[PDB]
Design a protein around this ligand. Structure first.
Ligand SMILES: [Mg+2]
Ligand SMILES: [Mg+2]
Ligand SMILES: [Mg+2]
Ligand SMILES: [Mg+2]
Lengths: 288, 284, 284, 284
């Protein structure tokens, strides 16, 4: 039988000693680089999928199709490594939440977050309608015997302020969500409070540096009491800076002038050539 | 009415003076970042497509669906910037070579390259099979009236040597292909020779450094007489070295330590936010 | 390079042309309608939902799903106009713009956008949000020089009344729409009344039988002054009733018992094997 | 603990008493319609996929992407019901056969077939064909998938019976679960193959009016087959019905569809009530 990295994530979350550190990846390449560096979890950023798949800002231009194709691909690079995937607002009503839940599960996604924003347009949907997306996800994975981890995100902080944020989290905890995600915590003090306010329920810190949140390392998050830290820009920021200074060097020099170690063979190795080659060798033949 | 950058690439190649630099791009970011640097053609690498879309080596794992979708979105980031796309071996026989051709045209691809390998090393098909692909591609764009530039590429140098490569390319030239492409050129002298051996007919140099070919710059390639130069790992080697570095620093420190400017807003404006905002604003 | 969007556009500026488009949901139903002699086709979203997804018409189809099926049907016979459901444009003006650009590149002759909320959890959006949709579509096609015909549909007849329905149809006309589409017309006096309320603007009749709408045949509808009549269930209804009977009979017998002309050779002929064979012979 | 119909099928096939009867379905409609007729296995046909998804003959036009998506939609209408899908030649070499196998597994497909034709009737040598079967088996062992590997040979009309048998023995020995002699030409050949490969599950393709005699499910079972498929069960009826309705609509200018043939009815055939329960349970 098939196993998923949902089940080992779930099992690590039911354990108070485990802390999940998941760099933000957005494509095959970033996923391979992060895995080679020895990360035991990855986070598929939706801002990065929008940037890579469509070359757009994150304005809600990825469909279910895009987002699931990208999460399934990242989940199956290393199937025993948990992937936490953005799932925006679930791509419609409860029928669409269920469909997303089932498709992410079949794809081997370990966890996905679902938020309280309006599909289209930060504009928010009433709490009732939000818990409706939560319930439909929990019931969907329940129908298919899936251990996928439901993360409940709330984008209500700046809009409606701390207590309303904590209210909407608690409503989603009561409707079955496995983890809470307060977007844009504004101080270390608010991060300690929310751990205490939703005591005993796992929480996820979103660590995008240089924004509403002070810079909190993974050892410090763990000690404040979070259960997951994600860094959605760990790969994007570096990649964009280097591609820009590489492009400009090419435009000056007329040749990329890459280090003698960036052979194409090496980039196929980063992408698991050796493993493909033994998959081909094992089937008999041949081509290598 | 409705316009493709194949027409304009096409006329550049007709001007004996135009020299085309196409850096290698693989996704929406690399594409956006290269257009921001001021480049006037792009090159969609299929190795880069296999690495980004699937996380795999360049081993023929991308389907026509896969490649056609990545090339349509890169092509429509800047619809007036010619895009040159890997089309591999045209994704099957004549019927599939024609779908690939029609699907790339509708999508506004400016040029694509078809090679002489099995689908499917390196390992080669015969000149008659290879020319059937080339003729399927030409006759298909003629039926729909597409100006898409058909690039005939050969991988026969390593196995069969120089005269075999040249004759495969003459065979393709005679079947209608607009540009030649001798892959894996092994010396400066052979670069000078192919150009004169196929005088009159424009040629593409694939410049992936530190492989089979000496390191030739845009400037040395235009002296030799190439009409197009491409740099497939131009976005992708820099992105890999930078991510690897950032990940093993994040592993040691427990925090990215990103430069103050690498913010999500930075990325949004790199990805054409101010224009997305104008579109919405203009609709009401 | 041409699309049927152009020819449908001038068919609609010429006052004597009337468009008869039977509902088609996959490539088979498209090939069968074309063979019957039909000069236009209508891609039902109801049917697309049922076929690609095996689901009721519940807003479960994505722009990815609708656009693939619309490109395919449009390109079975590129010179025959295809009118495609485009639901609510799959989001805000940013998505409405993508939808228009993608259908245009796809060869799709005409598409329709409505005033329902994208995601229920009939419920409509206000008129300004609706007009924003229609405006995003006109502007999007104008930027890329696309002739794709923009059909403004309203589902407000039941929820708001006929006077409101007419006001939303006039507000869509003012925003640049090419054709209007009152959904669910309840009588012929209302039919003749909408044609007159929006005099000089072409209107589309949705003729799904046994609904809110009396039975109006292509000729009567032309005579009244409609310029397009669609029959979304023309293929779906007969396909479903016959497959259900075939299956129950196979369940009873243990063998299908099909007519001797129900063969894989008849299928392939239906689905243009002779032309696929002309194409492959040509490349050789 | 997420479960797949591959497990129940593979376990049924270990139990001699079990006989598998599956009609051919090509899309969500024809699959809803067969399931409602009481069937407990479904066959996804490749010729019907090409005709529905692409509008084309069964010519090698479908891609892994086309074929895996239609397969996952069909498996997931009734996930406890086993679905046998076509997999052509597995879409490349060991690497693509393995992707095909992984992706089919994750989609809930219960069994698939891989045959011995060239990717692009012309056959590949036994060794190459066995490499695919072996790559299928090893791919699914690696992920712990119970997916059923069916080995198909199309060698009969080109090489005759004894070559056919040699190819299934070689697929068998490499790990395939079931054998599929395409185009069996008599009742005697049918008993001879079942026998020559005793104790190895066989499948009978039953497409009436071809080279195979009409053999019903009951007779196939009595013979020794473990699986009977009816690829054309839904295609034949669908095409004839639509043709006839299309021609009638052309003459009459109105479908004149039966009073039963409505949206409500389609939406019920495609699971409307179950969609509404799911909604009411969410809200809550
Ligand atoms: Mg998001
Ligand atoms: Mg390639
Ligand atoms: Mg619709
Ligand atoms: Mg097939």
């Amino acid at each position: 039988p098939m196993v998923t990295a949902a089940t080992s994530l779930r099992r690590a979350l039911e354990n108070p000693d485990s802390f999940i550190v998941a760099p933000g990846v957005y494509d095959g390449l970033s996923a391979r680089v992060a895995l080679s560096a020895g990360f035991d979890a990855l986070y598929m950023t939706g801002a990065g999928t929008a940037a890579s798949v469509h070359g757009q800002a994150d304005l809600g231009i990825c469909t279910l199709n895009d987002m699931r194709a990208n999460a399934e691909m990242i989940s199956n690079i290393s199937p025993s490594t948990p992937v936490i995937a953005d799932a925006d607002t679930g791509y419609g009503g409860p029928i669409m939440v269920a469909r997303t839940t089932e498709q992410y599960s079949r794809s081997g996604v370990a966890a996905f977050h679902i938020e309280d924003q309006v599909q289209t347009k930060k504009i928010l949907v009433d709490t009732d309608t939000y818990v409706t997306r939560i319930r439909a996800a929990v019931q969907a994975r329940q129908r298919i015997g899936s251990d996928i981890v439901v993360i409940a995100r709330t984008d209500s902080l700046q809009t409606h302020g701390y207590e309303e944020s904590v209210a909407r989290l608690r409503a989603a905890r009561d409707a079955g969500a496995d983890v809470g995600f307060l977007e844009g915590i504004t101080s270390r003090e608010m991060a300690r409070q929310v751990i205490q306010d939703l005591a005993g329920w796992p929480l996820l810190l979103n660590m995008v540096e240089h924004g509403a949140t002070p810079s909190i390392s993974a050892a410090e998050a763990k000690e404040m009491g979070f259960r997951i830290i994600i860094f959605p820009f760990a790969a994007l920021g570096p990649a964009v800076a280097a591609m820009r200074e590489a492009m400009e060097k090419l435009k000056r020099d007329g040749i990329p002038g890459l280090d003698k170690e960036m052979t194409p063979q090496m980039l196929f190795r980063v992408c698991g050539l050796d493993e493909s080659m033994k998959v081909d060798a094992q089937a008999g033949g041949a081509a290598f």
